[PDB]
Design a protein around this ligand. Sequence first.
Ligand SMILES: O=C([O-])CC(=O)C(=O)O
Ligand SMILES: O=C([O-])CC(=O)C(=O)O
Ligand SMILES: O=C([O-])CC(=O)C(=O)O
Ligand SMILES: [Mg+2]
Ligand SMILES: [Mg+2]
Ligand SMILES: [Mg+2]
Lengths: 223, 223, 223
Amino acid sequence: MNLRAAGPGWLFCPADRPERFAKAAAAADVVILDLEDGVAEAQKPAARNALRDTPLDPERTVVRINAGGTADQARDLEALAGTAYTTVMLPKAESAAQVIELAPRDVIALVETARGAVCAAEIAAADPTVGMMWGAEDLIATLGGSSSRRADGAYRDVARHVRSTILLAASAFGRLALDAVHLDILDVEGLQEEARDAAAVGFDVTVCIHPSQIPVVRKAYRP
Amino acid sequence: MNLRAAGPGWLFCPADRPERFAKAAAAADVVILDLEDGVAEAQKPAARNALRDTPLDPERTVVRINAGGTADQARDLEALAGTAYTTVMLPKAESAAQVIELAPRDVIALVETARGAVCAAEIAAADPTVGMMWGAEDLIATLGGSSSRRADGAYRDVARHVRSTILLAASAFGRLALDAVHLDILDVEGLQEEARDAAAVGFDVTVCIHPSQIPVVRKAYRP
Amino acid sequence: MNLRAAGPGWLFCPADRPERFAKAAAAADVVILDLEDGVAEAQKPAARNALRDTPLDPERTVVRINAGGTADQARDLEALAGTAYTTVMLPKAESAAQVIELAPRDVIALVETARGAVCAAEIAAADPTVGMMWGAEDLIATLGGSSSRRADGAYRDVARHVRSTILLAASAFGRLALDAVHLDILDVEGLQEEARDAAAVGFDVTVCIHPSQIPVVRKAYRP
Ligand SMILES: O=C([O-])CC(=O)C(=O)O
Ligand SMILES: O=C([O-])CC(=O)C(=O)O
Ligand SMILES: O=C([O-])CC(=O)C(=O)O
Ligand SMILES: [Mg+2]
Ligand SMILES: [Mg+2]
Ligand SMILES: [Mg+2]
């Protein structure tokens, strides 16, 4: 695997919508096929079938599976066996052990809980790890909070603290660093500012949830 | 103990002023009877006697004892034996061991030194721990600094870093998270902003030093 | 050694320019003779000779050597043997072991990489350590970034996170804390603000790269 060779534009795409796969792969540098919150709890088995019969370039495609310890992740690995994918994205990554149990595939840990932020280095250190990502939304939620950004749009302090935390963790161990998804899709000004900053700080990628986000991300990382 | 069931409004009240106990308990969700810097070094033995003959609901009352390794903390535990209190707040909490030696009572660790911030997770992990709190004032002081806030009123960076640090530590281990006391009592605008933010970020409590602070705190955590 | 007794004004001075040594020592509280990036890769052997025949007060002088594991650091220690200097500054300090191998001399660790920030406490804990310093420029560079400050001049978040990280690390272990060099020499307003803040937060020193920077630093730490 050499996802570092790919551009900075990564895009999420629900695994239950195989019709969009082709467009997504063509629009992004890397496509993250989602089996998690991007697919209804009743559409998962469908998304798993589509993940099989509708193949995508394993060179530029990662599969986001479900959280460690769940039944859905178990079903995800079973469905992943019938594909040529080697890299998985683990949500709510909270320990090296959750990463290790995914060996021998490559794992991008998505830190989005307090325990994960606290064990960020341990997670980035694990052998299977090839990338570190963070998410503000589940972070604030699992914290018992209700807002990741303040009035002025800027992320709250805890989220900023974590962003810097996973950047250092990922870097300290030669892992790829992925910046958080800009949830307000129509807010391209905001995305541009975060992406520019992410480029300037060392992040290698900024994940997008909408194809319209890719060109702004690719431009912010231009130079 | 179930202090989580109590409201977000916690209030400090010097143990040498038993006359105010009743008013305090009635005004706050939880009352922190203080045996530390809230009582003159010569009024401590008095505060200890008042802690005995003037009982308060052990369900909504915690006792802040003195720092680990001191003679005063020793005298505090002895005086605490003659009461129905189970939860203590430990100032200058700098290690799991300082928490552990307070077993079998429940402990809320108050991180307010560099060593404590550095060992925040170790402290939150300890078995006796049921809550994590932070304080900017002793933090800057023990750091050799002289100001916790900058011109614009906002906390300096080191303090903000620590605030986020104890929030993640406390949360990662299912502990209660208490935000720092707003020292400028008449500045309700400032308190409102910090409390709102604390509510939004996951803090479960914002400690107050004055009864007039409680209603603003309770409102900020409204929704 | 008692560098804490010295003023807050520390100044870098290339070891290949022995003519300036005298002026530098007279202008600063402590002089950091540089054998690293402050001297051309071809002028190093010259700087090493000048470090020998042109002595400076070992009480107020530290020598910045080259990174652990390099040939240049090896040549630096050999040249350092013929001098009365006891304290060295280690760039790209990334572990306790890199510090330990410099025993028995005193070491000021300069954290300026992700691994170093991640192991900040381990480094500050090492026996040889007497000081902790940080640098934004190599930090962003080694991170794969390209800018340590944002449009408004303020340091980017990752750099601010690290600054606070080495302050707590150094303090938690009774080490001296040195704030980052203000690269824009003619920007005295900016330096004044950072130095004032550093004074207020607990930093004991603010390193300068130009003699004109010392008086502003000394004034910011006045009170
Ligand atoms: O589902 C999404 O689109 C994004 C998501 O879960 C996350 O960032 O954690
Ligand atoms: O004494 C007080 O009122 C508050 C205090 O010590 C602290 O926050 O650490
Ligand atoms: O060379 C200089 O002048 C400053 C430097 O390397 C650093 O701060 O790391
Ligand atoms: Mg998520
Ligand atoms: Mg205190
Ligand atoms: Mg450098």
